[PDB]
Swiss-Prot record:
Functional summary from the UniProt entry: May act as a transcription regulator. When overexpressed, promotes entry of cells into S phase and cell proliferation.
Start-end of DNA-binding region: 1-55
Gene, per the UniProt record: NANOGP8
Family named by the database record: Belongs to the Nanog homeobox family.
Subcellular locations according to the entry: Nucleus
Organism superkingdom: Eukaryota
Lineage: Eukaryota, Metazoa, Chordata, Craniata, Vertebrata
Name used for this protein in its record: Homeobox protein NANOGP8
Biological source species: Homo sapiens
DNA sequence: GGCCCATTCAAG
DNA sequence: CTTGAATGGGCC
């Protein structure tokens, strides 16, 4: 799978301002991006890991 | 259930 | 080789 440049945008923007998202927030964010909840939740998790790594 | 973590695996 | 989406197990 691969995400659009359009998607990585709102995703990264949201992530920068909010590192933990609720169920509803993830689900709506997924809806307006025509993505599944799973891949968005997964993305966020992976991003949290990425954020951790930088040391 | 979600999160954490190590690990996997399909393209650049 | 790196990248990052995706997996499974362990924990609350």
């Amino acid at each position: 799978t691969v995400f659009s440049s359009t998607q990585l945008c709102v995703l990264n923007d949201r992530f920068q301002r909010q590192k933990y998202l609720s169920l509803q927030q993830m689900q709506e964010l997924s809806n307006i991006l025509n993505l599944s909840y799973k891949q968005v939740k997964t993305w966020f998790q992976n991003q949290r890991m990425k954020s951790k790594r930088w040391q």
